[PDB]
Symmetry: C3
Subunit: 376 residues, 3 copies
């Protein structure tokens, strides 16, 4: 007969038995503080200190680092080993008189990152009497305690999965969003045309045009680099700004200082009688990894297989997560049955050093597994 479920983050309340509601739209890039002494209706000399601190909205973006975009010049040469053979990016036609194209005057202009996942959050700290609790609350999730609920509801449409972020300088400060960075076909002149994915090695663009032998060679395709073409119409692209940036491997976090954006905050307080925590349950979970497949740094992602032991309940509807170092990369909602369970969790993100663990709530397995590299 029981059907325990902890996927509901929130409370049941009797509106007569609640003491304070705060409900407001908050600038995303602003913190908020509330301090009050809760006092009994003139009846008694017993007061409770309430102290709420909501931190500025943070964005966390799981990315694949694409390396550096380059500017360069396309050079045409006529011969009759090509004189230009040491150039990494080249194109040739033999007449049997050799025509060649090669890229030179290469210069890195920026660092590019492919967006895999976008998540917004606020750190929320609540002191109620001698209780003090801080939690990072995802947008569209809730902080739940015995006497205080804090829910954050919002929407942002600035970034999308698949977008490519370009940072030109030591770009704290800001960057550009590209919605059409070249992937499966890179032609000279495209955004993303000339890349170096790591220290060495260029991924060269295609040169779709034709040679002509005139004996002076000509090439009739585009001769302008993607960097120059983008700069020539730079106002066509969307900038964004950043503050207190934190790059880690395959992840970027920052606070967006765009003060036109807002989210909704609801705070409900009950002074005497505790809230009914809708996720309360007696079920106990043990976790370990079994296997993994797929890749980090990949829009396709990975799948972590977990062995999950349920005791103290016949069944338990919950979520098993793939996490490492308190960042979670995936979750699977599942009705567990008493005893052993096998649960597959699909995730995306992470880096070569990530060990993806099976987690429930704030509890994780003792070890995690490494996923494979992308773009092999």
């Amino acid at each position: 007969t029981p059907v325990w479920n902890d996927n509901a983050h929130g409370v049941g309340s009797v509106p007569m038995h609640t003491d304070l509601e705060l409900d407001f739209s908050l600038t995303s890039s602003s913190k908020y503080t509330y301090r009050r002494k809760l006092t009994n209706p003139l009846e008694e000399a017993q007061s409770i200190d309430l102290h709420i601190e909501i931190e500025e909205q943070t964005i966390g973006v799981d990315v694949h680092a694409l390396g550096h975009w380059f500017d360069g010049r396309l050079n045409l040469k006529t011969s009759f080993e090509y004189p230009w053979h040491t150039a990494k990016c080249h194109y040739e036609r033999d007449y049997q008189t050799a025509c060649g194209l090669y890229l030179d005057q290469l210069k890195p202009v920026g660092s590019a990152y492919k967006i895999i996942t976008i998540r917004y959050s606020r750190r929320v700290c609540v002191q109620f009497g001698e209780e003090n609790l801080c939690k990072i609350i995802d947008m569209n999730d809730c902080f739940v305690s015995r006497h205080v609920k804090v829910c954050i509801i919002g929407t942002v449409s600035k970034f999308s999965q698949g977008d490519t972020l370009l940072f030109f300088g030591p770009l704290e400060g800001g960057g550009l969003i590209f919605k059409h960075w070249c992937t499966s076909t890179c032609q000279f002149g495209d955004p993303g045309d000339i890349m170096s994915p790591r220290d060495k090695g260029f991924l060269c663009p295609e040169f779709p045009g034709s040679f002509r032998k005139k004996p002076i060679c000509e090439y009739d395709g585009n001769m302008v680099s993607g960097y120059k073409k983008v700069m020539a119409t730079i106002d066509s692209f969307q900038s964004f700004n950043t503050s207190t940036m934190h790059f880690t491997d395959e992840r970027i976090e920052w606070k967006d200082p765009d003060g036109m954006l807002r989210d909704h905050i609801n705070i409900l307080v009950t002074k005497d009688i505790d809230f009914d925590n809708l996720g309360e349950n007696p079920c106990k979970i043990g976790l370990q990894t079994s296997s993994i497949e797929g890749a980090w740094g990949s829009g396709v992602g990975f799948t972590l297989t977990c062995l999950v032991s349920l005791t103290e309940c016949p069944t338990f509807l919950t979520s098993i997560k793939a996490c490492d170092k308190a960042i979670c990369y995936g979750a699977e909602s599942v009705t567990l049955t008493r005893g052993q369970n096998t649960v597959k969790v699909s995730g995306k993100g992470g880096h070569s050093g990530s060990t993806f663990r099976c987690c429930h709530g704030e509890d994780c397995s003792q070890i995690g597994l490494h996923a494979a590299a992308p773009h092999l």
Copy 2:
């Protein structure tokens, strides 16, 4: 003086005269159950069974089926009727010595679908005493009854109108999202380059390169198929997973098992005094279709013209919908006047067998009209 309006789905309440509030963030891919006996404040022996069941979030996507994407090999031949003339996809230059390109070793690799409309919903069932009511509630809509309101608020940014969904296998399980599938220009090498829209008939890609007569012909454009180019950088594309998929003509429904996504649920209950239903009204509507124009399976859509009779009110602000088989494809907000009204409803989606009806609430006209086919 009256200005009746049923476009508000919700209730007016006196917060002193409400008995229970449930407010929580729910994993999108999870159901939720609440069961309680509502009992009078120790005053009386009269209790009310409350039973709420909220089903997992479902996505419904109106699509245009694009048929199958193919892999193939581009073959070059020299002649001096072309030997390769039976190939459906070809390109030739005459020297007067004929150079030809043709596609062969064709193989379907997946089924593609263009997104026209995305909508999320949850089925919500409420029993209050001997009252039992179930309704499919769209995200950002509300379940309204005399004693219980259930509102769902949320946002998802995974899919967008215009995206193309590719299913490789018998793909329940999952697929890929393409944001740049070729439409007005398909060149060999693009995602979507080689399509068969129906059983027979290829839509061939362009071959933008040039022939050279060397006498051996050469072609200096791209020789790698779109499938191979995409597979070579597959980690650049976004996967999604599915569960309990339901394909119908020009529509796909499933439950997304991504447990990182959440939505917000608010449940308000009044035990004694009924809620004020904000859409309550005495107005009565009769409906029939008059005409239609435009297309099913189309991002441009159709327009259904309805003849709508209003009685028992001088005016009535409401919505007239275009629906068939309990799926709605469009709605027009309108202030009707007593007597006959002509209302145009813009819609998108549906298939060749759809008969789009004029509807108000859960009431529809006796017949609907067929829209025209797209891509003629």
Copy 3:
């Protein structure tokens, strides 16, 4: 010790001391009216007229006007000054016999606009007794008064920054959304291929193909205009409809009549004891501009530097905005310190005549500054 903050738009309430809550999902394209006489619990003969009017959702889009898209025919000519030299858009090869391509039969087919910023709002008017106040409330913001709070929460995903809107006719009524309008590379056949940014002057597309001398010239690249290619697959593109359109320089406002879209409205009323306004503060701000850099009509945007004087508080967490004529284009959240402050505000949008002012709340500096033109 004080930490004043007006970035919270909302109220603190005691749920026992609140008299009425309205909570509902409203058709976006519908207005809503509520009228009630608030009367004391049978105790007294003193009533309060409440009158709330919520107007239909409006979209406001800051854009860059791109001018007109054209259809045309690509003509091939052989010579042996080119006979076709007066054509603005042309391409030639000399054999030393001259081959030329030129565009002719040009006709404007529509007006194009690049989306820079999208914002939705509703005008909300509240009369409570002899108090009457109207305000334009942004989606995800709140109307706050002593006795009434109105919050709007919603999400829409129809338009995105970077999209290009095309209006074919005198297009009130509607238009098309393009997600891939050509920017840094325009080739003949692309959406956006042939543009005239202003009265005169074409921005000509590239012709990526090759000439051949056969002596009759041939050109082996695409010969079909972007307009014809898009029309041939028009159902692949997304239409939208409009009502009561208002074009101004670099801005379009309208009401979207799509009645499938909804947003959430919450109205809270307290009859006796005032709400605690969470943004209440004694701080006083003076403002003037100092300098500006960057551009109007640009996805990259501008930065307005403001000199902001704070008195009556040691510190004040607030937002400084860049606005003109009651439209705001940017905001910066900032903790001001007593005395003079320098605050940089990043913004986007506006036009050549805009004078961007430093603003706080509904108060603005006496003059604003002009930003520079885009696309120089």
